[PDB]
Amino acid sequence: HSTAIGRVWLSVIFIFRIMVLVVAAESVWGDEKSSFICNTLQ
Amino acid sequence: HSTAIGRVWLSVIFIFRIMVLVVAAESVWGDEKSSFICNTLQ
């Protein structure tokens, strides 16, 4: 019992999301804190 | 033509002011700008 459209489309969109997250996490967000700087001596 | 009280008192107060200014300018106000600091990286 499974719809024809869903097994094709949901899985593809899920894989796309996973791939985008993999290519984004390592490089884009890697230095999110280390390169965060404020104009202060505090 | 000069008042008796004035020549005695005004000159003394003037000399006192000069002496205080001399003892204050060299040391108290000498580092007024060099030691002025602000909490900033700007």
3-state secondary structure of B14: helix
For B35, the enclosing helix (H) or strand (E) is none
Cited resolution, angstroms: 2.1
3-state secondary structure of A36: coil
Q: How many helices (H) and strands (E) does chain A have?
A: 1, 0
Shortest distance, CA B32 to any CA of chain A (angstroms): 21
Asked if A39 and B39 come within 8 Å (Cβ–Cβ), the reply is: no
Asked if A41 and B42 come within 8 Å (Cβ–Cβ), the reply is: no
Q: For residue B38, what is the nearest residue in chain A, using CA coordinates?
A: A41
Shortest distance, CA A28 to any CA of chain B (angstroms): 27
**Of residues B5, A1, A2, the one with CA closest to residue A10:** A2
**Measured distance CA(A4)–CA(B35) in Å, rounded:** 77
> Determined by which method?
cryo-EM
**Measured distance CA(A41)–CA(A34) in Å, rounded:** 17
3-state secondary structure of B23: helix
3-state secondary structure of B24: helix
What are phi and psi for residue B34, nearest 5 degrees?
-65, -35
